[PDB]
Amino acid sequence: LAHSKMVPIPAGVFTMGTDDPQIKQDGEAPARRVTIDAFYMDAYEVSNTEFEKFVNSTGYLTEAEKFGDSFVFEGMLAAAPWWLPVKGANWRHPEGPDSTILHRPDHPVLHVSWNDAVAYCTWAGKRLPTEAEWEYSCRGGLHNRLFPWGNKLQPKGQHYANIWQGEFPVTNTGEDGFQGTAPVDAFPPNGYGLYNIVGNAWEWTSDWWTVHHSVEETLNPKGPPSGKDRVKKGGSYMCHRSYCYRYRCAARSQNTPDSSASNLGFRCAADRLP
Ligand SMILES: *[C@@H]1O[C@H](CO)[C@@H](O[C@@H]2O[C@H](CO)[C@@H](O)[C@H](O)[C@H]2NC(C)=O)[C@H](O)[C@H]1NC(C)=O
Ligand SMILES: [Ca+2]
Ligand SMILES: [Ca+2]
């Protein structure tokens, strides 16, 4: 296993957002041309094993552990009725105090806040990616496609990401092989070498959230200078076309930086190799 390995994301210009927004309220539009300097991106979401190395080294107590609760999806035992604040849910206990990560060491770490993610990435000699870096990386060298791999959800009849199949939120058929999370190295990589950049766990980025974007061309944009929520990208194992079509690279959502949930993790980026 090399679950902290990074890949080189090449310098380029790309179209961020879309002029065919699917969730207009989220500021998916307008499409805008963005230039990104070469940098490195983690191939994988940060796993439980990798986060444990951080905690072993630093003693870091996550925000969920200090608050004493975190959000858990009802189906696997609030923003929606299916999100419950569960006492004692945290990265080591993803569904509550009598769940464990011992059988899922290579799954993405969950119940990590934006602050927890920044602590980890900086400890590792890295940083969070910006939303633009994240989206560029997600798109994997393709232009104006829905998904990292193109426009078909199941190219060649194959599952390419861990999302929901069935009737959400009542029945997840596990058709794609995973009801909850999958190992961080599951499913094919995209054109840049990245795994589970859509689906599996949501991923924090460094940007403050806004829905107001200009069509002006930008270089290495960092998002707005202020805000209340940070941007998360990529969707999770919970997403479905019928409710929550958020497993597209252009999709975007937010949470307060001290938030945590059982479908939200992260990966790191770096200017140079650590
Ligand atoms: C985090 O630290 C724990 C505690 O030291 C590690 O677990 C121990 O590892 C030693 C050395 O391999 C084993 O002999 C013990 O059986 C383990 N003890 C316990 C309490 O589990 C753990 O391996 C470290 N985690 C990572 C990812 O490096
Ligand atoms: Ca699934
Ligand atoms: Ca993901």
Q: Are 196 and 108 in contact (CB under 8 A)?
A: yes
Per the entry, the structure determination technique was: X-ray
Q: 56 C-alpha vs ligand 1 centroid, how far in Å?
A: 9
d(CA 63, CA 10) in angstroms, rounded, equals 34
What Cα–Cα distance (Å) separates residue 231 from each residue in 101, 183, 204, 208, 257?
27, 24, 6, 6, 9
Q: Is 135 helix (H, G, I), strand (E, B) or coil?
A: helix
Q: Are 107 and 182 in contact (CB under 8 A)?
A: yes
Indicate which ligand has the atom closest to the C-alpha of 182. 2
How many structural domains are present in the chain? 1
**Residue 199 is assigned to a ligand binding site:** yes
The tokens describing 169, both together, are 């939120």
127 lines ligand 1 (CB under 6 A): no
- Residue 76: how many other CB atoms lie within 10 Å: 17
d(CA 173, CA 192) in angstroms, rounded, equals 30
Pairing of strands 202-208, 83-87: unpaired
Q: Is 54 helix (H, G, I), strand (E, B) or coil?
A: helix
Q: Are 150 and 160 in contact (CB under 8 A)?
A: no
The domain in which residue 167 lies consists of 1-274
The tokens describing 131, both together, are 């939303």
What ranges make up the beta strands (E) of 10-132? 12-16, 32-36, 39-42, 69-73, 83-87
d(CA 201, CA 204) in angstroms, rounded, equals 10
Amino acid identity of 135? E
d(CA 141, CA 145) in angstroms, rounded, equals 10
53 lines ligand 1 (CB under 6 A): yes
Q: Resolution in A, one decimal?
A: 1.5
d(CA 166, CA 185) in angstroms, rounded, equals 24
What CATH number does residue 46 fall under? 3.90.1580.10
Residue closest by Cα to atom 4 of ligand 1: 56
Indicate which ligand has the atom closest to the C-alpha of 200. 3
CA 78-80-85 angle, 5° bins = 30
Rg (CA), the chain: 17
